[PDB]
Design a protein around this nucleic acid. Structure first.
Ligand code: MG
Lengths: 389, 49, 237, 49, 53, 171, 104, 94, 123
RNA sequence: CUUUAAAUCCUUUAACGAGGAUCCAUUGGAGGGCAAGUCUGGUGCCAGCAGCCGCGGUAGCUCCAAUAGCGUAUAU
């Protein structure tokens, strides 16, 4: 065990250096540093990882409300922080604002003709600020457009990406925006001061998804690259995780230290910062399809997790939306129930309160026309979640 | 004219070398006490047959 | 341009027996059509005054490239029995059947069932072709269908070409017969260089009691390809 | 002459003068207490003089 | 003027070297067009194989 | 020093090999070939001297592992070829393919090798954030997917150059 | 499309022995040259709601590539404390203090 | 003689080869900090310690001309294959 | 499975095939479509042929194996035309694609390894 | 601008700056071309050496090797 002895001795030597740094950190100077540690511990206590999986019960099809106003398949959707309105976009290049309580259309942004502002190509991603003030949408025309959420008034048009924009997410509590594209670059945008900050590199293929939280940090899915990367912007560091096989299409953060991702080979994985490889791996989350001898698992199109809890929802074209439970330490994933819903689940977003789940249903996949489901309706479905102890 | 040669340069001669040994080459190698395979590898830094 | 349809042209015999030269603005290599009025793979044919010849494409056949490259002997002459290993669909086999004529016989061996159906359809029209749908690695499995032959032509493209040819040569090839083997250097050993492969293949032929006589490359039409012509069990002189 | 892939290792003077007339083939010989190569571009670790 | 820059001088030497090599050896080409002949003669008396003994 | 003059200065084979390498890779003179030959000579000598030792000798194992990792990192070897034998199999053209000039040429950014050299020398090529103007830059395995046009270059969406502005001012 | 100059503050600490606050300043200017110190002072005074006379900044180095600049800044409680606590050369940079030649 | 032996062991533990085994078996995710140099060099290490002292103490120190030239000497050296075959001794550890 | 789809790649080889196809598309070295795949075989500029076994008529791609036997070009089948579509960089399923011979290409080592693996499937 | 006690240097950056792109790379080695021209020796019309010099007139040939580097002499 020569390799083990060298690794063990090297670990002992590394601990000596950390002791010297701790003494210098111990030396409002150090009092302010200790106050920062207290807030972080209290913040950790804020994310107490509340267990609400058992109280969730499967709803009924009659309870599910179906809003139909889009011409083509819905690609993405977001929920306003106040849980009052839903913004949705589709392949018809239009954006429609829906009222959660009534289901009527509040405002409709038409497709720009080839001069009212609008999108001339398919809209792939949308993000909304934590205060509900700003709305951002990305399209295939390498453009990012900013809208005033309350009035749907166009404000800014961000240029600079060299390919289609695929991911957008606002930093929670701020107006800082992170954007990614098929040009393998990640850019930083400050919406309030309508300025460009910097560009980050490191991905080797087209980026599929992006998510962020209150920390000055974001995660991205590598697609065909097969890697998921954590971007430490102030520290100027990049973490690389190697996990499940196949293209990684969708991702969602569970808390500040965990995330869930979905792949095109049916695998769903739970990740942790401590371990490079995924902690949990659920293979064939939505079953298998195909003729005998040519069977392949259903593609995972969207994933979602309820913030600071253990509830995970995965969407595919297997005509059902599945609810999952994260195990202790996020090491096990357990299926709760199946919500019958026919079509491609292109988007899944939990409400801020957690009382309902919004699913985007389209006849086709959000990235192409490889499948077309005639029985599916291009609609935004509000799935009510009822909690009884 | 062989296609291997780019004028006077032999391109298909590769790092695995196949070499013809003469009868007097063996005897003089023993007289100088030079190991046959080992000394050839020192000259070329490659596998020699 | 090229040899457009409707152009006057002259046909003269080649140095090799059964092969002809199509002299004109361009020169093409042609063979006499055993079944007049039919094209096997869309080649251009010439009508001669009852007599018809078919052009030979050296890019789709390895025997034509060797002839155009300046080989000495092909040993395929009218009235000879030829064993062909790796017939595939039969593009080269059709030209071989033209050379041997009605008196000669061609034995076509092809393991693939997809390409095997094409040989049978070709064997419908040409009475001198005997299709054999069997693996060339086991000559004992079709020893009933084949008598003694004069020339063995191999285009099997396998790492074990010499072993396959030697097994067939011992069983079916007569004393004093000849063999023509096409070697694709990338197929036997990709790691070794092309010419170092050619020296190794020649050596293995000598260890199988076969005497190679000549070799040449097919450089204008193929890359890293060689053709070896030799004799099996030579008679005393 | 046939294959052009070998390197000739010999110490006889008349044989070496014959090989030099053949293009593209290196010659290996013994000089001092070491092996040496004559007509190789990729000589690398050869005696330096 | 070509002597002023040694890099473009070596570029010209390579271009001539490929031209001179065309006399010695034949370059490989694909069937980018349907076969229509040699564009030249077919000489049947020249024997360019290498004898093995 | 980084290069050594050839032991035999008048050799037709050596001159032909140098001509072929310079013409194919767009090099400036013989010194650029000699530097790569010298580096490969050191690497293969180290591989041989490691191959001389015992298999279970810890020095052989450790130094060979480190050398293989470095050579895989620079991209000359394959992950399936992690042995000293494949180090001995290495050639000079393998190191020649790793220069930034030929990497730019093979990636379609330039339509010629000398055009790639000119583009690099005129500060038009970037690897990640940094702008690189050294033709002999060795591209690592990870950086190979991050070669592009610089943001300030006219080809990369930047401001048009002097000639465009002067011609537009003329008309 | 407009470019902006961005200012970020790090390692902010208040030194009560000198009645001041000190911090590290990061300047984002992707396209333009190095920002002059007066512009930095007025922007920092706007950010911290003080008069520009009591900000002293120095040590500005631009990173290779021209993307970011890093410097140090200090904000005083009052002008008299700045006159009493600052080095003479930094006061002369603001014109508050003037050096005198001495005969030898 | 005890001081030389213990110091000799320390140098071997921090050799590049011993650290090379570490990232192979490190279950922790690989960290990729952006830097102009691909690998660790002695001159880059001196820059890191200087800049960490820079943020601790709010003062700018001067740099000797021989050091600044050595900085750029490493900068040109970084995009060159000169030290592939250079490895530190490991006999002290084993 | 349809027995005519004989060289069916397994799970491990499928990932290698689809990865190389996406890499070849970036280098402008890929021909997409059944008609375009046929043309490269006639011109002799093809490394290998990748076909999808899930075509509702499998019969429309069965002419490609016949052309491959004459040119000695390896070929395989994959289980999904939709998965083959993504690597080809198109928004529609693809039932046949061809990798083109390119001089000086740096994908030669990856292509050569795949060709040996395909030939191994045919015993 | 920034730098610095002050200034220089490095890093940023505004405007000018290329068709013979004359905004003109060198050193060493080996060859070709010539008149109403000069000298010498002969085998009538030749040969050697050489040739910015002629009757009158004064208003930028080729090839090879190395390349910002490249020769010579002596000793070895
Ligand atoms: Mg011009």
């Amino acid at each position: 065990e020569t390799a083990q002895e060298k690794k063990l001795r090297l670990a002992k030597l590394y601990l000596e250096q950390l002791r010297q740094q701790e003494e210098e950190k111990a030396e409002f100077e150090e009092d302010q540093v200790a106050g920062r540690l207290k807030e972080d511990v209290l913040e950790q206590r804020g994310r107490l990882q509340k267990l609400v999986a058992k109280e969730i019960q499967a709803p009924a099809s009659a309870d599910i409300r179906v809003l139909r106003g889009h011409q083509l398949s819905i690609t993405c959707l977001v929920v306003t922080p106040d849980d009052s309105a839903i913004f949705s976009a589709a392949k018809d290049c239009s954006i429609i604002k829906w009222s959660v309580e009534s289901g009527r259309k509040l405002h409709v942004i038409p497709r720009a003709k080839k001069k009212p502002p609008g999108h001339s190509s398919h809209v792939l991603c949308m993000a909304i600020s934590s205060d509900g003030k700003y709305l951002a949408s990305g399209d295939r025309s390498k453009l990012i457009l900013i809208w005033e959420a309350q009035s749907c008034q166009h404000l800014y048009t961000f240029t600079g990406h060299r390919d289609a924009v695929s991911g957008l997410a606002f930093r929670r509590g701020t107006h800082q925006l992170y954007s990614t594209s098929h040009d393998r670059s990640v850019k930083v945008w400050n919406v309030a001061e309508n300025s460009y900050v910097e560009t980050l590199f490191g991905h080797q293929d087209a980026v599929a998804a992006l998510d962020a939280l209150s920390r000055e940090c974001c995660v991205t899915a590598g697609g065909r690259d097969g890697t998921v990367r954590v971007w430490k912007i102030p520290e100027e560091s990049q973490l690389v995780f190697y996990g499940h096989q196949g293209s990684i299409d969708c991702i969602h953060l569970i808390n500040e230290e965990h995330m869930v991702s979905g792949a095109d080979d049916g695998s769903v994985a739970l990740w942790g910062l401590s371990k490079k490889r995924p902690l949990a791996l659920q293979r064939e989350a939505h079953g298998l399809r195909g003729e005998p001898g040519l069977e392949q698992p259903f593609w995972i199109s969207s994933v979602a997790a309820l913030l600071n809890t253990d509830l995970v929802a995965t969407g595919s074209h297997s005509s059902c939306v599945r609810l999952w439970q994260c195990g202790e330490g996020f090491r096990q994933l357990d299926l709760l129930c199946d919500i019958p819903l026919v079509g491609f689940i292109n988007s899944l977003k939990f409400s801020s309160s957690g009382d309902f789940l919004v699913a985007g249903v389209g006849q086709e996949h959000r990235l192409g026309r490889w499948w077309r489901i005639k029985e599916a309706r291009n609609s935004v479905c509000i799935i009510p979640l009822r909690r009884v102890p | 004219h062989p296609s291997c040669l780019f004028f006077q340069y032999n391109t298909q001669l590769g790092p695995p070398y196949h070499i013809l040994v003469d009868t007097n080459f063996i005897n003089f190698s023993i007289k100088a006490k030079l190991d046959l395979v080992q000394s050839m590898m020192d000259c070329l830094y490659a596998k020699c047959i | 341009r090229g040899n457009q349809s409707g152009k006057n042209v002259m046909v003269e015999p080649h140095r090799h027996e059964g092969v002809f030269i199509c002299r004109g603005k361009e020169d093409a290599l042609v063979t006499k059509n055993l079944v007049p009025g039919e094209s096997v793979y869309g080649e251009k044919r010439v009508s001669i005054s009852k007599i018809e010849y078919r052009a030979w494409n050296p890019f789709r056949s390895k025997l034509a490239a060797a002839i155009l490259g300046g080989v000495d002997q092909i040993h395929i002459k009218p009235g000879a029995k030829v064993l062909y290993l790796g017939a595939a669909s039969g593009t080269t086999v059709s030209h071989v059947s033209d050379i041997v004529g009605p008196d000669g016989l061609v034995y076509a061996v092809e393991f693939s069932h997809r390409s095997g159906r094409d040989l049978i359809n070709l064997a419908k029209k040409r009475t001198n072709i005997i299709p054999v749908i069997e693996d060339a690695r086991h000559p004992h499995k079709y020893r009933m269908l084949i008598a003694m032959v004069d020339v063995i032509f191999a285009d099997v493209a396998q790492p074990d070409q010499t072993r396959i040819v030697a097994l067939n040569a011992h069983t079916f090839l007569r004393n004093g017969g000849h063999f023509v083997i096409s070697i694709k250097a990338n197929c036997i050993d990709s790691t070794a260089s092309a010419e170092a492969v050619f020296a190794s293949e020649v050596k293995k032929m000598q260890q199988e009691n076969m005497k190679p006589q000549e070799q040449l490359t097919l450089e204008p039409y193929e890359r890293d390809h060689a053709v070896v012509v030799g004799v099996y069990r030579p008679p005393p002189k | 002459t046939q294959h052009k892939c070998y390197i000739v290792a010999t110490v006889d003077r008349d044989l070496k003068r014959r090989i030099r007339k053949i293009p593209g083939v290196p010659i290996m010989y013994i000089s001092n207490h070491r092996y040496n190569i004559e007509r190789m571009p990729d000589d690398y670790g050869a005696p330096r003089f | 003027k070509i002597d002023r820059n040694p890099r473009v001088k070596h570029r010209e030497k390579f271009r001539r070297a490929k031209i001179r090599r065309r006399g010695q050896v034949r370059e490989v080409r694909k069937e980018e067009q349907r076969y229509s002949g040699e564009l030249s003669g077919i000489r049947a008396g020249v024997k360019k194989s290498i004898k093995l003994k | 020093k980084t290069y050594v003059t050839p032991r035999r200065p008048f050799e037709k084979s050596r001159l032909d090999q140098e001509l072929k390498l310079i013409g194919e890779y767009g090099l400036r003179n013989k010194r650029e070939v000699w530097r790569v030959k010298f580096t490969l000579a050191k690497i293969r000598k180290a591989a041989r001297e490691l191959l001389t030792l015992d298999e279970k000798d810890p020095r052989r194992l450790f130094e060979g592992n480190a050398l293989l990792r470095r050579l895989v990192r620079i991209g000359v070897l394959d992950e399936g070829k992690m042995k000293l034998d494949y180090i001995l199999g290495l050639k000079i053209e393998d190191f020649l393919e790793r220069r930034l000039q030929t990497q730019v040429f093979k990636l379609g950014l330039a339509k010629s090798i000398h055009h790639a050299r000119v583009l690099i020398r005129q500060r038009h090529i970037r690897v990640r954030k940094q702008v690189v103007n050294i033709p002999s830059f060795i591209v690592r395995l990870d950086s190979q997917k991050h070669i592009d046009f610089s943001l300030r270059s006219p080809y990369g969406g930047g401001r048009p150059g002097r000639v465009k502005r002067k011609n537009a001012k003329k008309g | 499309m407009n470019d902006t100059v961005t200012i970020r503050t790090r390692k902010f600490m208040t030194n009560r022995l000198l009645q001041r606050k000190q911090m590290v300043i990061d300047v984002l200017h992707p396209g333009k040259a190095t920002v002059p110190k007066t512009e930095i002072r007025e922007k920092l005074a706007k950010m911290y709601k003080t008069t520009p006379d009591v900000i002293f900044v120095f040590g500005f180095r631009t990173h290779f590539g021209g993307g970011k600049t890093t410097g140090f800044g200090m904000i005083y409680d009052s002008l008299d404390y700045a006159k009493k606590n600052e080095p003479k050369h930094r006061l002369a940079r603001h014109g508050l203090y003037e050096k005198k030649k001495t005969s030898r | 003689e005890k001081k030389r032996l213990e110091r000799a062991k320390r140098r071997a533990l921090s050799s590049s080869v011993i650290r090379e085994l570490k990232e192979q078996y490190s279950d922790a995710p690989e960290e990729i900090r952006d830097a102009r140099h691909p690998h660790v060099t002695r001159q880059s290490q001196e820059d890191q310690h200087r800049i960490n002292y820079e943020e601790s103490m709010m003062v700018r120190l001067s740099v000797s001309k021989r050091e600044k030239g050595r900085r750029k000497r490493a900068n040109v050296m970084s995009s060159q294959l000169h030290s592939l075959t250079h490895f530190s001794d490991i006999s002290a550890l084993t | 499975v349809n027995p005519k789809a004989y060289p069916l790649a397994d799970a491990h080889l499928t990932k290698k095939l689809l990865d190389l196809v996406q890499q070849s598309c970036n280098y402008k070295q890929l021909r997409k479509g059944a008609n375009e795949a046929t043309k490269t075989l006639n011109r002799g500029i093809s490394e290998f042929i990748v076909m999808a076994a899930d075509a509702e008529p499998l019969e429309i791609i069965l002419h490609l194996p016949l052309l491959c036997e004459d040119k000695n070009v390896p070929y395989v089948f994959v289980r999904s035309k939709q998965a083959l579509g993504r690597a080809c960089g198109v928004s529609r399923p693809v039932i046949a694609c061809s990798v083109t011979i390119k001089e000086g290409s740096q994908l030669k080592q990856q292509i050569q390894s795949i060709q040996q693996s395909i030939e191994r499937l045919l015993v």
